[PDB]
Write an enzyme that holds these catalytic residues in place. Structure first.
Site, PDB file in Angstrom:
ATOM      1  N   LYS B  10      31.119   2.993  61.381  1.00  0.00           N
ATOM      2  CA  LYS B  10      30.483   2.417  60.197  1.00  0.00           C
ATOM      3  C   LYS B  10      28.940   2.528  60.159  1.00  0.00           C
ATOM      4  O   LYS B  10      28.303   2.826  61.170  1.00  0.00           O
ATOM      5  CB  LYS B  10      30.954   0.961  60.023  1.00  0.00           C
ATOM      6  CG  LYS B  10      32.476   0.834  59.974  1.00  0.00           C
ATOM      7  CD  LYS B  10      32.860  -0.651  59.736  1.00  0.00           C
ATOM      8  CE  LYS B  10      34.321  -0.842  59.345  1.00  0.00           C
ATOM      9  NZ  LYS B  10      34.653  -2.285  59.124  1.00  0.00           N
ATOM     10  N   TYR B  50      40.491   1.591  50.775  1.00  0.00           N
ATOM     11  CA  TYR B  50      40.860   0.223  51.123  1.00  0.00           C
ATOM     12  C   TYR B  50      41.750  -0.467  50.079  1.00  0.00           C
ATOM     13  O   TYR B  50      41.729  -1.698  49.965  1.00  0.00           O
ATOM     14  CB  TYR B  50      39.597  -0.628  51.336  1.00  0.00           C
ATOM     15  CG  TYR B  50      38.861  -0.312  52.617  1.00  0.00           C
ATOM     16  CD1 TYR B  50      39.431  -0.600  53.846  1.00  0.00           C
ATOM     17  CD2 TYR B  50      37.601   0.292  52.605  1.00  0.00           C
ATOM     18  CE1 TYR B  50      38.762  -0.317  55.025  1.00  0.00           C
ATOM     19  CE2 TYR B  50      36.936   0.587  53.779  1.00  0.00           C
ATOM     20  CZ  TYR B  50      37.527   0.271  54.984  1.00  0.00           C
ATOM     21  OH  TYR B  50      36.900   0.538  56.174  1.00  0.00           O
ATOM     22  N   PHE B  58      36.925 -10.510  50.369  1.00  0.00           N
ATOM     23  CA  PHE B  58      35.865  -9.704  50.968  1.00  0.00           C
ATOM     24  C   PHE B  58      35.754  -8.288  50.378  1.00  0.00           C
ATOM     25  O   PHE B  58      34.846  -7.530  50.734  1.00  0.00           O
ATOM     26  CB  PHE B  58      36.095  -9.605  52.478  1.00  0.00           C
ATOM     27  CG  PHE B  58      37.484  -9.124  52.857  1.00  0.00           C
ATOM     28  CD1 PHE B  58      37.781  -7.762  52.896  1.00  0.00           C
ATOM     29  CD2 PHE B  58      38.489 -10.033  53.183  1.00  0.00           C
ATOM     30  CE1 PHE B  58      39.053  -7.315  53.250  1.00  0.00           C
ATOM     31  CE2 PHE B  58      39.763  -9.592  53.541  1.00  0.00           C
ATOM     32  CZ  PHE B  58      40.044  -8.230  53.572  1.00  0.00           C
ATOM     33  N   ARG B  86      43.447   0.426  68.440  1.00  0.00           N
ATOM     34  CA  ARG B  86      43.226  -0.943  67.946  1.00  0.00           C
ATOM     35  C   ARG B  86      42.709  -1.810  69.073  1.00  0.00           C
ATOM     36  O   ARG B  86      41.758  -2.580  68.915  1.00  0.00           O
ATOM     37  CB  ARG B  86      44.510  -1.573  67.398  1.00  0.00           C
ATOM     38  CG  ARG B  86      44.861  -1.138  65.982  1.00  0.00           C
ATOM     39  CD  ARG B  86      46.026  -1.913  65.402  1.00  0.00           C
ATOM     40  NE  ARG B  86      47.015  -2.279  66.413  1.00  0.00           N
ATOM     41  CZ  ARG B  86      48.309  -1.997  66.330  1.00  0.00           C
ATOM     42  NH1 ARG B  86      48.773  -1.315  65.298  1.00  0.00           N
ATOM     43  NH2 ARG B  86      49.137  -2.383  67.289  1.00  0.00           N
ATOM     44  N   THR B  92      38.271  -8.042  64.771  1.00  0.00           N
ATOM     45  CA  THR B  92      37.399  -7.685  63.639  1.00  0.00           C
ATOM     46  C   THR B  92      36.061  -8.378  63.678  1.00  0.00           C
ATOM     47  O   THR B  92      35.059  -7.820  63.241  1.00  0.00           O
ATOM     48  CB  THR B  92      38.012  -8.079  62.301  1.00  0.00           C
ATOM     49  OG1 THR B  92      39.337  -7.565  62.226  1.00  0.00           O
ATOM     50  CG2 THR B  92      37.201  -7.493  61.178  1.00  0.00           C
ATOM     51  N   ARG B 106      33.828  -3.139  69.403  1.00  0.00           N
ATOM     52  CA  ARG B 106      33.160  -4.092  68.524  1.00  0.00           C
ATOM     53  C   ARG B 106      32.305  -5.097  69.306  1.00  0.00           C
ATOM     54  O   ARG B 106      31.296  -5.600  68.810  1.00  0.00           O
ATOM     55  CB  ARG B 106      34.172  -4.800  67.634  1.00  0.00           C
ATOM     56  CG  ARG B 106      34.758  -3.856  66.573  1.00  0.00           C
ATOM     57  CD  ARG B 106      35.891  -4.518  65.795  1.00  0.00           C
ATOM     58  NE  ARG B 106      36.249  -3.742  64.618  1.00  0.00           N
ATOM     59  CZ  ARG B 106      37.460  -3.751  64.060  1.00  0.00           C
ATOM     60  NH1 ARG B 106      38.429  -4.495  64.604  1.00  0.00           N
ATOM     61  NH2 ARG B 106      37.711  -3.016  62.971  1.00  0.00           N
ATOM     62  N   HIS B 119      36.075   1.161  62.167  1.00  0.00           N
ATOM     63  CA  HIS B 119      37.379   0.957  61.541  1.00  0.00           C
ATOM     64  C   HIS B 119      38.408   1.734  62.339  1.00  0.00           C
ATOM     65  O   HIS B 119      38.099   2.823  62.822  1.00  0.00           O
ATOM     66  CB  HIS B 119      37.399   1.523  60.104  1.00  0.00           C
ATOM     67  CG  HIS B 119      38.778   1.600  59.526  1.00  0.00           C
ATOM     68  ND1 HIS B 119      39.368   0.539  58.866  1.00  0.00           N
ATOM     69  CD2 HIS B 119      39.724   2.569  59.601  1.00  0.00           C
ATOM     70  CE1 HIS B 119      40.601   0.870  58.515  1.00  0.00           C
ATOM     71  NE2 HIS B 119      40.844   2.095  58.953  1.00  0.00           N
ATOM     72  N   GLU B 130      45.577   6.937  55.737  1.00  0.00           N
ATOM     73  CA  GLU B 130      44.151   7.054  55.990  1.00  0.00           C
ATOM     74  C   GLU B 130      43.710   8.436  56.472  1.00  0.00           C
ATOM     75  O   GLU B 130      42.663   8.938  56.077  1.00  0.00           O
ATOM     76  CB  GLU B 130      43.698   5.979  56.977  1.00  0.00           C
ATOM     77  CG  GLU B 130      43.691   4.585  56.331  1.00  0.00           C
ATOM     78  CD  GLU B 130      43.346   3.471  57.300  1.00  0.00           C
ATOM     79  OE1 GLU B 130      43.010   3.734  58.486  1.00  0.00           O
ATOM     80  OE2 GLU B 130      43.430   2.318  56.858  1.00  0.00           O
TER      81      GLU B 130
END
Lengths: 141, 141, 141, 141
Positions: B10, B50, B58, B86, B92, B106, B119, B130
């Site tokens: 991101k 998305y 959000f 993941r 998140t 993260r 992501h 995706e």
């Protein structure tokens, strides 16, 4: 319902200068073009694209031809697009197309069974696979 | 089984100069990178990408952020890739990731719940959607 | 002045899992990455990309190697980028790089004269040609 | 000599369903299409593409229009292509085209000065810039 399907204009129709007329036909038939590009299959990609026919007798010939020159792919969108586009292009054998479907793309621009001007997805499943093989969501506009 | 999943680095992690470290992490964890590109979502494309969250509170914030600057997407391939990736990225909420998964991407590069560095596809269904949204079969090499 | 140059991470460094480390190095050196993608040269495209060396003795070897697997290209932007990037990658002969430029990319990740990890544009003229060969203005973001 | 030039089919000609006819015209005129794609300018990219006119009074209108919908670009190759393609498309004002060049693309498909159906590179320098802006060497096949 409104659907998306893939067409590919093959090297024979390319060399004949048929690209504009072929796209125009689909435009006149009421489809939206949602993606479009000229590219060239490597033999390996053509083989992957046509994985379902890997066992068939014509496979190697198809893979070589479809990688023998640049091609043009388009995503066509419209009501009942998958079935209608199939019908518009006509039977795989261009000579048979002239005999039974004289207004079809293959009748107009195809030469024989191998040089038959154009590919189109033949089912909802294959359309889904084929569109993704050639265009990402980013290229659909 | 061997699987493919999508990551996107991101804008926040991009600006922090984390791209090389993030890719290196996945390489060290034993994944093959099968596709890779820097691009920029338009707000419209980020919205489509998305689509499942279009009802969430959000959504607009996410769409704006994900179109606020260039990002880098990769297709990662490996045994059990979807669940493993993941787990490597962590929860998140970046702050929470520092509390419960301190070696996660993260935790290392995320700031908070919105600027959370990266992501990853969260299921086989969303991975399939995706990857096709960002990369065609022609870009997977 | 602020300049753009092209790098390509070669199949040897790719297989070694060096991609993330290599991009990280350029990030730490203060360059902006303006474009990035994984792709594969056909032998023909590699030949065109390297047209200047078509007469050289190593040409066929180079063309084959550079089309033997996927590579990653990036546009690097920064003050004096073309000459600085050349210096960071080091001499073409990886062995010699280890002897005279031990912190260079080729010293770290190159094997020999052919498997030397990485390509960079060597002049403003070649940078202009090479960047356009691989990336359109649309891909620079 | 053999040259390459860029055309873009604009949103007005797109909406009118003129794409196939326009490409067909260039094919009949004896050009090879070397690259082709449907895409959408962001306002920013349209502005960069048209940087030379940034000072002109019409700039903002042009940038907005050229980013208002998808367009199709093609690289055309042939003897004297740059000059010949200019002449084939006709004067910028579609209404004037109908008056002084009634067989020109703009006369046939253009509406007025802004919705004038098509862009073409106007010099060797601009052709070189414009082709690279839209298509990489990888896309030219």
């Amino acid at each position: 319902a409104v659907e998306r399907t893939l067409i590919i204009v093959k090297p024979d129709a390319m060399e004949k200068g048929a690209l504009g007329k072929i796209l125009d036909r689909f435009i006149q038939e009421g489809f939206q073009i949602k993606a479009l590009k000229m590219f060239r299959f490597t033999p390996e990609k053509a083989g992957e694209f046509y994985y379902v026919h890997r066992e068939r007798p014509f496979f190697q010939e198809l893979v070589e031809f479809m990688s023998s020159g640049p091609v043009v792919a388009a995503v066509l969108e419209g009501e009942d697009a998958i079935k209608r586009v199939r019908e518009i292009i006509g039977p795989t054998d261009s000579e048979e197309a002239r005999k039974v479907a004289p207004n079809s793309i293959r009748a107009q621009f195809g030469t024989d069974k191998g040089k038959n001007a154009i590919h189109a997805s033949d089912s909802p499943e294959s359309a889904q696979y084929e569109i993704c093989f050639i265009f990402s969501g980013l290229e659909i506009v």
